Design a protein around this motif. Structure first.
Motif, short mmCIF file in Angstrom:
data_model
loop_
_atom_site.label_atom_id
_atom_site.label_comp_id
_atom_site.label_asym_id
_atom_site.label_seq_id
_atom_site.Cartn_x
_atom_site.Cartn_y
_atom_site.Cartn_z
N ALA A 262 0.80 -1.07 -0.16
CA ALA A 262 -0.11 0.03 -0.19
C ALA A 262 0.73 1.17 0.10
O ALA A 262 1.89 1.17 0.49
CB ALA A 262 -0.90 -0.01 1.17
N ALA A 263 0.27 2.33 -0.24
CA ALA A 263 0.92 3.63 -0.41
C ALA A 263 1.18 4.05 0.97
O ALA A 263 2.31 4.83 0.99
CB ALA A 263 0.36 4.59 -1.31
N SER A 264 0.67 3.69 1.91
CA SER A 264 0.64 4.44 3.29
C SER A 264 1.86 3.71 3.96
O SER A 264 2.64 4.60 4.63
CB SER A 264 -0.52 3.97 4.26
OG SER A 264 -0.41 2.55 4.54
N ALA A 265 2.29 2.38 3.56
CA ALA A 265 3.42 1.85 4.15
C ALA A 265 4.59 2.04 3.42
O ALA A 265 5.67 1.18 3.31
CB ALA A 265 3.14 0.46 4.54
N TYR A 266 4.64 3.07 2.63
CA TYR A 266 5.94 3.40 1.61
C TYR A 266 7.06 3.62 2.35
O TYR A 266 8.16 2.94 1.84
CB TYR A 266 5.54 4.36 0.63
CG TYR A 266 4.51 4.19 -0.33
CD1 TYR A 266 4.64 2.85 -0.96
CD2 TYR A 266 4.11 5.01 -1.33
CE1 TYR A 266 4.00 2.33 -2.10
CE2 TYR A 266 3.73 4.84 -2.59
CZ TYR A 266 3.60 3.42 -2.78
OH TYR A 266 2.95 2.94 -4.12
N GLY A 267 7.16 4.27 3.47
CA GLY A 267 8.33 4.58 4.11
C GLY A 267 8.72 3.66 5.39
O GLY A 267 9.62 3.77 5.81
N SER A 268 7.70 2.66 5.57
CA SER A 268 8.16 1.62 6.51
C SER A 268 8.68 0.42 6.26
O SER A 268 9.49 0.54 5.11
CB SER A 268 6.64 1.27 7.38
OG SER A 268 7.07 0.26 7.84
N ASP A 269 8.89 -0.54 6.88
CA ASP A 269 9.44 -1.84 6.50
C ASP A 269 8.65 -2.51 5.75
O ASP A 269 9.45 -3.55 5.09
CB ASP A 269 10.16 -2.42 7.70
CG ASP A 269 8.77 -2.99 8.54
OD1 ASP A 269 8.09 -2.25 8.90
OD2 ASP A 269 8.86 -4.10 8.89
N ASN A 270 7.34 -2.34 5.68
CA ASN A 270 6.50 -3.26 4.77
C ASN A 270 6.77 -2.98 3.36
O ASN A 270 6.14 -3.64 2.41
CB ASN A 270 5.02 -2.84 5.11
CG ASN A 270 4.86 -3.22 6.62
OD1 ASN A 270 5.79 -3.42 7.58
ND2 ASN A 270 3.60 -3.40 7.01
N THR A 271 7.30 -2.03 3.04
CA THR A 271 7.72 -1.47 1.57
C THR A 271 8.47 -2.66 1.07
O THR A 271 8.19 -2.91 -0.35
CB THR A 271 8.64 -0.35 1.57
OG1 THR A 271 8.01 0.56 2.34
CG2 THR A 271 8.24 0.18 0.15
N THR A 272 9.19 -3.52 1.81
CA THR A 272 9.94 -4.64 1.13
C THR A 272 8.83 -5.87 0.91
O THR A 272 9.40 -6.64 0.17
CB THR A 272 10.91 -5.11 2.15
OG1 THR A 272 10.40 -5.36 3.70
CG2 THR A 272 11.92 -4.21 2.44
N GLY A 273 7.78 -5.75 1.30
CA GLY A 273 6.77 -6.80 0.83
C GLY A 273 6.83 -8.11 1.95
O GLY A 273 7.79 -8.05 2.98
N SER A 274 6.38 -9.08 1.67
CA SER A 274 5.95 -10.28 2.51
C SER A 274 7.43 -11.21 2.14
O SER A 274 8.03 -11.08 1.19
CB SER A 274 4.97 -10.90 2.27
OG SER A 274 3.94 -10.55 3.31
N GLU A 275 7.47 -12.24 3.05
CA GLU A 275 8.47 -13.41 2.75
C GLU A 275 7.97 -14.62 2.11
O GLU A 275 7.02 -15.13 2.56
CB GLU A 275 9.12 -13.84 4.24
CG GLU A 275 10.38 -14.59 4.01
CD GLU A 275 10.61 -15.35 5.18
OE1 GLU A 275 9.95 -15.26 6.12
OE2 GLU A 275 11.70 -15.96 5.66
N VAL A 276 8.67 -15.21 1.30
CA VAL A 276 8.36 -16.42 0.59
C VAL A 276 9.21 -17.72 0.74
O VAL A 276 10.46 -17.44 0.75
CB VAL A 276 8.28 -16.19 -0.95
CG1 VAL A 276 6.89 -15.23 -1.39
CG2 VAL A 276 9.48 -15.38 -1.41
N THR A 277 8.63 -18.57 1.41
CA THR A 277 9.35 -19.64 1.89
C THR A 277 8.97 -21.26 1.12
O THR A 277 7.90 -21.03 0.24
CB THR A 277 8.81 -20.23 3.50
OG1 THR A 277 7.62 -20.39 3.50
CG2 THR A 277 9.43 -18.75 4.15
#
Lengths: 49, 51
Positions: free
Chosen positions: B17-32
Motif C-alpha cells: 500500500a502507499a501508506s506503508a511506503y516509508g516503513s519496513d512493509n515496503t519490502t513486502g512479505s517473505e516467501v518460503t
C-alpha cells in the motif's frame, strides 16, 4: 571575554542505506557547550510582574 | 532404494500500500519453501521347474 565555547567535534554528516525500507537516512551530529570562567559577567532586564 | 528431490510450488509477492511506503512493509512479505523427496524400490519375481 568571560565566555568560551568548548567543542569536541564539529558538524559532521553521515549517510546510511536502509534496504529494509529503501530510505537513505542522513545523520548530522556535533558536540558543543557554552561555559564561563566565573560566576559573573551577565545582566538581564525583565518586564514588570 | 533411490531417493529423488522434488521442488516445491510457487509463491506470490504482494502489492504494498502507499501508506506503508516509508516503513519496513515496503519490502513486502517473505516467501518460503521446503524441498521434498520421493523414493523408489523394487520387487522380486521368480519361478522354477524341474525335469
Amino acid at each position: 571575554d568571560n565566555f568560551v565555547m568548548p567543542r569536541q567535534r564539529a558538524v559532521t554528516v553521515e549517510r546510511e542505506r536502509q534496504a529494509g525500507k529503501q530510505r537513505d537516512a542522513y545523520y548530522v551530529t556535533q558536540r558543543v557547550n557554552l561555559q564561563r570562567y566565573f560566576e559573573n559577567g551577565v545582566v538581564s532586564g525583565a518586564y514588570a510582574a | 532404494i533411490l531417493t529423488m528431490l522434488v521442488e516445491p510450488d510457487a509463491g506470490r509477492a504482494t502489492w504494498v500500500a502507499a501508506s506503508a511506503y516509508g516503513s519496513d512493509n515496503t519490502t513486502g512479505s517473505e516467501v518460503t519453501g521446503a524441498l521434498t523427496e520421493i523414493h523408489f524400490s523394487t520387487y522380486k519375481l521368480a519361478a522354477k521347474s524341474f525335469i
